[PDB]
Amino acid sequence: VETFAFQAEIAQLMSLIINTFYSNKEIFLRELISNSSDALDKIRYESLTDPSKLDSGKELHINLIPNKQDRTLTIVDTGIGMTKADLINNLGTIAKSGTKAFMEALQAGADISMIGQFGVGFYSAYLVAEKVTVITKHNDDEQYAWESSAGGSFTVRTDTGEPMGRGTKVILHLKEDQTEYLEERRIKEIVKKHSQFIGYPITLFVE
Ligand SMILES: CN(C(=O)c1cc2c(C(=O)N3CCCCC3)[nH]nc2cc1O)c1ccc(N2CCOCC2)cc1
């Protein structure tokens, strides 16, 4: 298990997300489904020049898996996935600029719901989750587990769990007062409101 400090601006945004009073918490799901759709668009596009990139799985979809017993909401996609270098350096380097721009926009009157315009919508997961676990598998790398309970640090390890084939699985360990996001009717309403035109099948698993 390797422990890393988040870039200062990212840690700052995570504290702002956790500490700001903001009732419209449901936007976290739109943001995560969007990121899934982008990873799916990426593998679809790449497989046009290299069809072998779909050897790890041809199906392009999103699964929404609530678990009341574990108090977890899992968002699974069969997108391009992420390499170790993406999880540790690449995505965070880029997110540094988006994060700074977003925090400046909030100071100028913008709302937390506009987070996606700055490419840092992922951090909206901390509106509802005390801990986020990300399992990922890219064709060019091994399966990794990224994890953070905020507090300025995250961990990355090789994942010895069930092999994913290709894609990303976001496991949200929900805050005790955010269990409405495990309810089928609540998840259906959010998907219909914010993610109605996503170009991939979104399957909501029932318990
Ligand atoms: C390739 N890819 C993924 O496989 C993937 C990443 C996800 C995150 C996330 O953002 N993570 C999770 C781990 C810590 C870093 C952040 N959340 N849900 C995700 C679902 C996914 O399929 C990916 C997809 C979209 C993006 N951004 C969209 C917005 O513009 C900036 C790039 C970046 C990478």
Residue 171, classed as helix, strand or coil, is strand
Task: For strands 129-137 and 72-77, give the pairing.
Answer: unpaired
Say which CATH number the domain at 138 has: 3.30.565.10
Ligand 1: centre distance to CA 82 (Å) = 8
Residue closest by Cα to atom 25 of ligand 1:
35
Give the annotated binding-site residues for ATP. 35, 77, 96, 122
Residue 59: other Cβ atoms inside 10 A: 10
Report residues whose beta carbon is within 6 angstroms of any ligand 1 atom.
32, 35-36, 38-39, 77, 79-82, 87, 91, 119, 122, 134, 136, 146, 168, 170
Residue numbers belonging to the annotated binding site: 35, 77, 96, 122
Strands across the sheet with 167-174, in order?
2-5, 153-158, 144-148, 129-137, 167-174, 72-77, 62-67, 202-204
- Tell me the CA–centroid distance for residue 125 and ligand 1, in Å: 12
For the chain, what is the domain count? 1
β-sheet bridge partners, residue 67: 72
Domain that holds residue 64: 1-207
CA-CA distances (angstroms) from residue 158 to 32, 48, 123, 163, 199? 23, 30, 23, 11, 31
Q: Residue 6 gets which letter from DSSP? A: P
Residue with tokens 């600029």: 97
For residue 39, the CA-to-ligand 1 centroid distance in Å is: 7
Method: X-ray
